[PDB]
């Protein structure tokens, strides 16, 4: 199920998550949260949990691009205070 994730954190706290190519059934060509930093804003929030497929972050559509590209998308907003993601649990 789709769900708009909202991770309110501070700069210098990237997010704390690991993404990979969606090799699953491929419902949506995106990335998969294969890992998460149990302590950062990712685990603190709770809205984000391993086994979810992230489509777009703050507008940055990932549904289509490779893994390296997606990684760049997130690592780019390493100084964000609110991560608005649209993933599917």
């Amino acid at each position: 199920e789709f769900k708009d994730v909202f991770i309110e954190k501070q700069k210098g706290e990237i997010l704390g998550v690991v993404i990979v190519e969606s090799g699953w059934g491929s419902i949506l060509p995106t990335v998969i949260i294969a890992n998460m930093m149990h302590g950062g804003p990712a685990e603190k929030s709770g809205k984000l949990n391993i086994g979810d497929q992230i489509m777009s972050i703050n507008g940055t559509s990932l549904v289509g691009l490779p893994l390296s590209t997606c990684q760049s998308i997130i690592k780019g907003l390493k100084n964000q205070s609110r991560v608005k993601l649209n993933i599917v649990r």
Partner: peptide, 4 residues
């Protein structure tokens, strides 16, 4: 595995 490089965390974002």
């Amino acid at each position: 595995p490089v965390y974002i």
